Write a protein that binds this ligand. Structure first.
Ligand SMILES: CCCCCCCCS[C@@H]1O[C@H](CO)[C@@H](O)[C@H](O)[C@H]1O
Ligand SMILES: CCCCCCCCS[C@@H]1O[C@H](CO)[C@@H](O)[C@H](O)[C@H]1O
Ligand SMILES: Nc1ncnc2c1ncn2[C@@H]1O[C@H](CO)[C@@H](O)[C@H]1O
Length: 309
C-alpha cells in the first residue's frame, strides 16, 4: 500500500533531518561538547541509521517479495537490531540524567568520556545479541509457506518475504517485547519518578536545583510518554496475535499504523529532548537560519532587481 509506503518515507526523512541537525549542533557549538551529550549523539546516530537503513528495509518486508527465507530473515533481524540500538542509546540518556540528579557531585568523576563510550558499546552489544537471536535458529525458516510463495509466483527455494513469516511471534512477545520495550520503559519510568520525587521534596521545603529538576522531569516525561505511545501499540497487537491464534488477524491498516508509529520514535527521540536545551536550540536556529539566508537568495536578488527597475 503506497499510502503506507509514503507516510513511512516521510518519517525516514524527518528522522534523518532532525538527528543530523542534532549531530551537526554538537560539532559547531563548543559548549555542547561534554560527556552528557555523547549519549545524545549516540541516540541521534542510531535514529539516523533507523531512517537511512531500518525504515527502507521495513518497507521491503511489507511487499512480500520473492527471496530466500534466510535472506528475508537477515533483513528483518537488521531492522530489529537498529530499532533496538535506538531504544538503548535513548535509555543511556535517561540513566545519565538519573546519575546527574541523584549523585551530581561525583557525576563529573564517574561519568567520564571514556566510560561514556563504554556505555555506548554496551548499547550496541545488547542490540546485536537481541536482534540477531533469530539468526541462530529461532526463526520460522524451517516451515516455509509455499501456498503463499506460489501466489506471488516465487521460484523454487523462495518464499514471500514477510516479517510475520520469518520472525517468530514468541521471540517477539517473550524476548523482543520484554528486552527492548517493557524493561527500558520501566527503567526510564523509574528514573522519571525519582526526578519527580526530588522536585516534590524541594517543593515541600519551600513551604517552611529545583528549576533544573522540574525541567528534567518534563524532559523525561516527554521521552517516556512518546516512547510508550510509539512502541506499545505494535507490541500489544503482537501479543494479541500471539495469544489469539484463532482470532481473525488484526487489520492491515492497523498493522501499517502501528509499524509507522513505532518508527516515529526516531524523529521525536531524542530530538525533542535536545530541542529543550537552549544551547542546542540557539545553535539549531543558526543552522536553519543560514539555510534560509542562502537558499532563498536567488529569489531575494530576483525580487530586488525586478522592483529596482
Ligand atoms: C546456538 C544455537 C541455537 C539453536 C536454536 C534452536 C532453538 C529452536 S528455535 C525454533 O526453530 C524452528 C525452525 O528452525 C522454528 O520452527 C521455531 O519457530 C523456532 O522456535
Ligand atoms: C538462541 C535460541 C533460543 C531459543 C529459545 C526458544 C524459546 C522457546 S519458548 C516456547 O517454545 C515452545 C516450543 O518452541 C512454544 O510452544 C512456546 O510458544 C514458547 O513459549
Ligand atoms: N508484526 C509485525 N509486522 C511487521 N513488522 C514488525 C512487526 N513487529 C515488529 N516489526 C518490525 O520490527 C521493528 C521492531 O520491533 C518495528 O519497528 C517493525 O518495523
Amino acid at each position: 500500500s503506497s499510502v503506507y509506503i509514503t507516510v513511512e518515507l516521510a518519517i525516514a526523512v524527518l528522522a534523518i533531518l532532525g538527528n543530523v541537525l542534532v549531530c551537526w549542533a554538537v560539532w559547531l557549538n563548543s559548549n555542547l561538547q561534554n560527556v552528557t551529550n555523547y549519549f545524545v549523539v549516540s541516540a541521534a546516530a542510531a535514529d539516523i541509521l533507523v531512517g537511512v537503513l531500518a525504515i527502507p528495509f521495513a518497507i521491503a518486508i511489507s511487499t512480500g517479495f520473492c527471496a530466500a527465507c534466510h535472506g528475508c530473515l537477515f533483513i528483518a533481524c537488521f531492522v530489529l537490531v537498529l530499532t533496538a540500538s535506538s531504544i538503548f542509546s535513548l535509555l543511556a540518556i535517561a540513566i545519565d540524567r538519573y546519575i546527574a540528579i541523584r549523585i551530581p557531585l561525583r557525576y563529573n568523576g564517574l561519568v567520564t568520556g571514556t566510560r561514556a563510550k563504554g556505555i555506548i558499546a554496551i548499547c550496541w552489544v545488547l542490540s546485536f545479541a537481541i536482534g540477531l537471536t533469530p539468526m541462530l535458529g529461532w526463526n520460522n525458516c524451517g516451515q516455509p509457506k509455499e501456498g503463499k510463495a506460489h501466489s506471488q509466483g516465487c521460484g523454487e527455494g523462495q518464499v514471500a518475504c514477510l516479517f510475520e513469516d520469518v520472525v517468530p511471534m514468541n521471540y517477539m512477545v517473550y524476548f523482543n517485547f520484554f528486552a527492548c520495550v517493557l524493561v527500558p520503559l520501566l527503567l526510564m519510568l523509574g528514573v522519571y519518578l525519582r526526578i519527580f520525587l526530588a522536585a516534590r521534596r524541594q517543593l515541600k521545603q519551600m513551604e517552611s536545583t529545583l528549576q533544573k529538576e522540574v525541567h528534567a522531569a518534563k524532559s523525561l516525561a516527554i521521552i517516556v510518554g512518546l516512547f510508550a505511545l510509539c512502541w506499545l501499540p505494535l507490541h500489544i497487537i503482537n501479543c494479541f496475535t500471539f495469544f489469539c491464534p484463532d482470532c481473525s488477524h488484526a487489520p492491515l491498516w492497523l498493522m501499517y499504523l502501528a509499524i509507522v508509529l513505532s518508527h516515529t520514535n526516531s524523529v521525536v527521540n531524542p530530538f525533542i529532548y535536545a530541542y529543550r536545551i537552549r544551547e542546542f536550540r540557539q545553535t539549531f536556529r543558526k543552522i536553519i537560519r543560514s539555510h534560509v539566508l542562502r537558499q532563498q537568495e536567488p529569489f531575494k536578488a530576483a525580487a530586488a532587481e525586478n522592483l529596482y527597475f
